[PDB]
C-alpha cells in the first residue's frame, strides 16, 4: 500500500514481551484500539481509509496461520489520524464467520474508528498480544474476540503518536 503499510507489514515480532518501561508497555499492551487514548490527547481522531473489502486465503499469508481457515475475510487498512496527522497504521483481518450479529459492524465501520466503545453489548477478550518493530517504530499484533468470535488486529505506531 502506503509507506506506513509497508512498514506495518515489515514488523518483526514477539509475545516474547520485551522489558520496556511502564508507560510504553501500558500503551502496547492496551486491550483496546488506540482511538479513545488518542482522543484524550485533545485531538479529533479520524480514519483515512486506505482500503477494505473481502479477501481470500491467498491474500493473507501472514495472518492465515493465526486465523480459522475460511472462504473469505474482511481486510481493512487505515491510517488513524489526530487533527489530520497519521498517528497509527491499522490492519484488521476478520474471518467471515465473525461478521454477524453485532460483530457485523466490523465490515461496516467505514470512517468510524474502531474501539471497544463501539460494542456495548459485546464482551471483548484477547487470545494474545505480541509486540514488534521495524525501522525504529513499535508495532503490535493481537488476536481479539468479540462475543467469542476472532479478529486479527495489527497496529503500527508512527513517529508523531504519543508512544514516542
Residue in this structure with the C-alpha cell 481470500, named with its chain if needed: 56
Distance CA 103, CA 94 (A): 10
114 close to 90: Cβ distance less than 8 angstroms: yes
86 close to 38: Cβ distance less than 8 angstroms: no
CATH entry, 1-164, from 3.40.50.150, 3.40.1410.10, 3.30.420.10, 3.20.20.70:
3.40.1410.10
Distance CA 149, CA 28 (A): 22
Grid cell locating 1: 500500500
The reply, when asked if residue 133 is annotated as ligand binding, is no
Grid cell locating 117: 466503545
The reply, when asked if residue 63 is annotated as ligand binding, is no
The reply, when asked if residue 49 is annotated as ligand binding, is no
Q: Where are the domains of the chain?
A: 1-164
Could you give the C-alpha distances from 94 to 63, 72, 121, 151, in angstroms and in order?
A: 10, 9, 19, 5
Nearest CA among 108, 92, 96, 99 for reference residue 34 = 92
Amino acid at each position: 500500500s502506503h509507506p506506513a503499510l509497508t512498514q506495518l507489514r515489515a514488523l518483526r515480532y514477539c509475545k516474547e514481551i520485551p522489558a520496556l518501561d511502564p508507560q510504553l508497555l501500558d500503551w502496547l499492551l492496551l486491550e483496546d484500539s488506540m482511538t479513545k487514548r488518542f482522543e484524550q490527547q485533545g485531538k479529533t481522531v479520524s480514519v483515512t481509509m486506505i482500503r477494505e473489502g473481502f479477501v481470500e486465503q491467498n491474500e493473507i499469508p501472514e495472518e492465515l496461520p493465526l486465523l480459522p481457515k475460511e472462504s473469505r475475510y474482511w481486510l481493512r487498512e487505515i491510517l488513524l489520524c489526530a487533527d489530520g496527522e497519521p498517528w497509527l497504521a491499522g490492519r484488521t483481518v476478520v474471518p467471515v464467520s465473525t461478521l454477524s450479529g453485532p460483530e457485523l459492524a466490523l465490515q461496516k465501520l467505514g470512517k468510524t474508528p474502531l474501539g471497544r466503545y463501539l460494542f456495548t453489548s459485546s464482551t471483548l477478550t484477547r487470545d494474545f498480544i505480541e509486540i514488534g518493530r521495524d525501522a525504529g517504530l513499535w508495532g503490535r499484533r493481537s488476536r481479539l474476540r468479540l462475543s467469542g468470535k476472532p479478529l486479527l488486529l495489527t497496529e503500527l505506531f508512527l513517529p508523531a503518536s504519543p508512544l514516542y
